[PDB]
Amino acid sequence: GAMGSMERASLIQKAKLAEQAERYEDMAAFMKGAVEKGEELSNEERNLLSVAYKNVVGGQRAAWRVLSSIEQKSNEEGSEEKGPEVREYREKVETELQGVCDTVLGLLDSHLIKEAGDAESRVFYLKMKGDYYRYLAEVATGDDKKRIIDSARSAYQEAMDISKKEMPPTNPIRLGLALNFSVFHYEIANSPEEAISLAKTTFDEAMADLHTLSEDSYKDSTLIMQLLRDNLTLWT
Amino acid sequence: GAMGSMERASLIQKAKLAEQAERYEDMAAFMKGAVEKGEELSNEERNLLSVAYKNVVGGQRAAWRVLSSIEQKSNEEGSEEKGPEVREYREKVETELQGVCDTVLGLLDSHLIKEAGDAESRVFYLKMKGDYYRYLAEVATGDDKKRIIDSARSAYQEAMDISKKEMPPTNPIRLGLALNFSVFHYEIANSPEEAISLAKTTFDEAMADLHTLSEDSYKDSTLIMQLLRDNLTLWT
Amino acid sequence: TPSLPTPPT
Amino acid sequence: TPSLPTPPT
Ligand SMILES: *Cc1ccc(S(=O)(=O)N2CCNc3ccccc32)cc1
Ligand SMILES: *Cc1ccc(S(=O)(=O)N2CCNc3ccccc32)cc1
16 A cells, blocks of 8 residues: 555654644544554544545535436426436446445454444444444445445444443434444434434433533533434434 | 547536546646647637646745745754655646746647647647746746746747737737746746736726727626735735 | 535544 | 635636
């Protein structure tokens, strides 16, 4: 790989520079290089990996949705035929998005998850696994679509089981996992009631534990609680 | 080139889709492919070429400025040594920016400018030539720096001479050219008085011609006049 | 629906 | 200083 000659510490330093520069494709390539050094990632390094790839794939998903909407409009009655270009370009963006998701999943499988023994690392990576399978599910249509959805569900579920056993109900990773798994239920699995139930129970159980927290911890936990409440407001 | 097998009309269609998707690197690659078909560009196609590349290079310039600032801070007294990484990454972004500018300049030289005979096309391309040499000047430091600045000046000057002879003082291309050449004077050529004089004269001469315009033309001309006034306000 | 945002590190 | 912006086409 093209980052094989660069020191691990240099790749991390450059990832932080790339973030400041809003160069997220570079950031992701630096963090991929850092993972490929073979060592486990620290808390801060896990967050850099996640920020890099969520920014890259987020841009691709936004583009895909714009193109898919145009393509949908084209297939309505009354619409003039404009040739294969919209489908072709949606397909190009889709293939690139799938490639990035496969790359992230490949890093998780080789070998981040298997070496992650502490709850904060393992839950973090399984949450990532669920998210990137969820992004693959958003664009899936073929024979493996149910399997893609089930792979996201399985990852999220394992993360949930560990987080419930090993983390307090206010832990930000636990909260963000619950937020994203609730979105999976609502947007991917056609299970809005499960989505609502999970968001409500997560919010309530976090509320009850806020008393144990420092001011700083409270800020982080309450921020994600408000995001859960925002979705509950949207869904009800 | 990788767009050689795609129809010209398809490349233009996809450029417009890429714009909607905010996929400006794709947009630029499609428009490069369209220029390389060898035919002259229409007004609308010239604007797509410009939008694509200005968005790409604008992102690179913003990143370069962030990195150059960090690099400057590192060379101040009191700053801890952090190794070669900031310089290396600034240099990487700089080389990529230079590459894009060279690509655009190469399209202009092969063969857009030489085939552009009407004032609206020729002025547009010479303005582009000045702008992309100006972006090269922003990052230049070596033996050719004066020559890079002079290449921007020469392009802008030829554009100005044609625009004054062939276009009304309210023409948006003429106005935008004057705006950018004034910025060249102020930011690159160490000539703030020339910058101010050019912006003032351009504004005044446009004001005097607004009476000839339709409501729609007035909107476009007055928008760029306000940008000239904004710079005059900043500079005085 | 919004999922978890990605603030700067 | 700001140069000419690049609005959507
Ligand atoms: C999945 C996950 C959950 C929390 C965190 S964080 O480090 O607390 N953090 C950064 C990512 N997004 C976020 C939103 C609100 C509050 C905190 C965060 C990281 C990743
Ligand atoms: C260089 C130049 C000048 C004007 C034009 S435009 O087509 O009138 N246009 C699009 C680019 N920016 C802009 C700003 C304000 C008003 C109009 C425009 C294009 C290119």
